[PDB]
Design a protein around this nucleic acid. Structure first.
Length: 115
DNA sequence: GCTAATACCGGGGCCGGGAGTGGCACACACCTATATATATGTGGCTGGGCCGGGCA
């Protein structure tokens, strides 16, 4: 289908331009449509200061959007859970525009050393 | 002159937190044991002679 080609695209871009934990979180969202913050912490066994910059990096690239869902279950605790969701069109647009900017920025450097 | 729908304020009940307390993990210095030369520098303890108090 067309939806799976977007998944392979995100795997190629995140795997190709970032480290491993980025595709760890990425695949962790590709397996579960709504991934809680406590599930990703207990999954990769990473600290909060290590889960922070990863989610912030995946949000700065417009790859995923977050959904802070409310909770008032058992102990009447307002348990908020940041459920991550893959933003397909904004991520594809980010990939296309970033590729265009890479081509344009690598084309300008050739004209300077030509003379 | 008369009546029903609308909006503002207060009280009792309910939820999040962060400095406090406590717990867990990792890394680095101490200092006990022993050795010689050296000496001022006391700190502390003990025996003999002298004096004052108790006793015959």
């Amino acid at each position: 289908p067309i939806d799976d080609i977007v998944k392979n695209l995100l795997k190629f871009v995140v795997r190709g331009f970032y480290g491993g934990s980025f595709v760890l979180v990425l695949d962790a969202i590709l397996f579960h449509s709504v991934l809680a913050e406590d599930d990703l912490k207990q999954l990769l066994s990473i600290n909060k200061t290590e889960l922070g910059p990863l989610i912030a990096r995946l949000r700065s690239d417009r790859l995923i959007s977050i959904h802070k869902q409310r909770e008032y279950p058992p102990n009447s605790k307002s348990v908020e859970r940041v459920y991550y969701y893959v933003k397909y069109p904004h991520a594809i647009d980010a990939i296309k525009w970033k590729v265009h900017q890479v081509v344009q920025r690598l084309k300008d450097d050739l004209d300077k050393n030509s003379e």
